[PDB]
Amino acid sequence: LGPRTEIANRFQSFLRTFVDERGAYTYRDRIRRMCEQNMSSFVVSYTDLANKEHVLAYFLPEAPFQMLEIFDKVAKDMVLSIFPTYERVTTEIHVRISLPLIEELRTFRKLHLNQLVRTLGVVTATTGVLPQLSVIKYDCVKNMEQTLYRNYQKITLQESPGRIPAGRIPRSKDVILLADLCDQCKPGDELEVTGIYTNNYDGSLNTDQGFPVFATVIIANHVVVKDSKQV
């Protein structure tokens, strides 16, 4: 896609050229800060993003995931180009967003699928933290070993018991987290999330009973803790 040409330029012209707030922009330093803490969660703020170029809100939603590819390739190509020193260890990347507009539960519907989202929740019971599979390999005769992994934990959120619509039922939704954004969920807290809406890969697609069994699922690019009860 020849379009893919210009986007990374608009990143590459943006992560190591921009200055805001009277110099030494974070992007010069956050990466290395991340690199010094081995973190892989370098953050963007959409407000600064629109301060430079708000065009990244309107070619995004035809597939924001390819946008995130077009983010991570740039980041990678900055780190190991500038920290080829880094070229040993983990050597993979993704970024974060914090469109800092609060929007609410019980509104995502027919027209909120797989698109630019921003939502909260409140946390309750879920499972441990466990792994998955990642890659396309299994064959040689004419594989279930040496096949890279990625951790996993299930969520469960809940909604504000303060801003309730007066005897409307407290509700519930099934949502996901992933390896790097994991081991921070616990019962009884809230967490503000970038958020993104879809369904299962295939949630029971067939002639069936008098109603399909369909679910709806979300994950976070960014999570920013709202509670933070220590320093």
Binding site: R32, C35, E36, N38, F83, P84, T85, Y86, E87, R88
Partner: protein
Amino acid sequence: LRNDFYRQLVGKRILIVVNYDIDAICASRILQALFKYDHMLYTVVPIMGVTGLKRAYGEHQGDVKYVVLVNCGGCVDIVELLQPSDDVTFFICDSHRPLDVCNIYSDRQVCILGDASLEENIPAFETIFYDLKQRARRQWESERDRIMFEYTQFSYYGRSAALMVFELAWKLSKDNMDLLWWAIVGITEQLLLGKIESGAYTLELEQIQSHVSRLTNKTNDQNTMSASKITFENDLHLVLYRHWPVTESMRYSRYSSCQLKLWTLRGEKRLHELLLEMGLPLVHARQTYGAMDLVLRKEFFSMVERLAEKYDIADIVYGTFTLSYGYRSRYAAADYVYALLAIMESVKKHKTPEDCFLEASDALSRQHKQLLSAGIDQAKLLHAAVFRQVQSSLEARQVHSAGSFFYYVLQEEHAFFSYPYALGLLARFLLRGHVATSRARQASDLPLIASCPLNASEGMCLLVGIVPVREDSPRNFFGKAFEQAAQKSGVALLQDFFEPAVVQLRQSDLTRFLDSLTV
């Protein structure tokens, strides 16, 4: 020259191995062997002070006339002390260097291993032991501009203890590669410019190199396990590189701490930001080097030598040696001397000091190597119990200026510090901390004094001395300085140890001693 004297050594003898030092066993165990080499039985001495001199020798009023002197000589007109000498010969190989000329002459009962390009002290016999009255004193004092500039201004030490014995012995068909290691023990014992100066270190890059870069008596087939001869490489004397992770060096090292300020936080952020430039991991920065993965461990010094060029520490490359026996290890000569002091354990049995001396002298054998591991252990924890007073002190500021020096006192002892020489170390660790670093050097370059709580020995205010740093070779006035209040008043003072810079006061007769000594 003892090519004529050594060959006299067949009759009865004593091998004194003098007062507390690593130099002792290095330059003697050689000869505890060599005695049974000439079919000579050997006899040795535990010494702790001039105390020990004749309470030991006075038990042995004989005439055994082939006799050692090391680490002493700055003692007495040695016939006046060792009067039972009638012609009883002595043999000196002492490092207690600046000696009086009373002791050389009567040249029957001493041997002068002194030859130097410094011919400045000739008429001291023509002044002291020879000395009209007015002009006598004119000579006396106008030349004590030089004479009292000796022995009333400062003091120092000289050269090896058995490198002389090496010079004798490499000719005698003896290539004890192990004993060349022992020589290196004696080298980094006190020839370390970190402790006391060599300077010519940079030209002993040739010396023992040319001894052994000469010599591979198996120049063609040297690939065997036992006793492979040792190999030179440019290496460190950073603290104990080997068995603990990098972050232990990066914490417990001074030449970082003087230049990088590590006990605080920005030291640590800055450290991380350099481990970026090395791009080492953090696990990998917290496993023992021997424990880490490999290519990082391998490529370490190759990068560290170069891209440490730029960051306020110029002087981490040195020239050193390191070896093993077989497949368990690769020891390093510098990874030993800090283990040596670990059995110098000052326990309250009365058994500990001397028998630990026997233990240490049992230690430098290849057969006796288990115990050395425990020494390494103790040293690490010692190095981290340093901190047990550092940040509590450097931030609380126990520091006292006290005029034209800096003044410190501790007032509670440590079983760690019953052994004394910690008192030198912590000084040399911490004056850096505030009194050098939160300031310019103008309030930094002065020496320092260190109390010693004696919670065990009834309270006697033990001490050691210190220099300013970055000008070390300018010898210590403290060689004299503490005679000041001793000379003005004198207060229960002893000089019972071999060393000048060492003293013993009363627990509570120390402040007026100071106000006398302030000047």
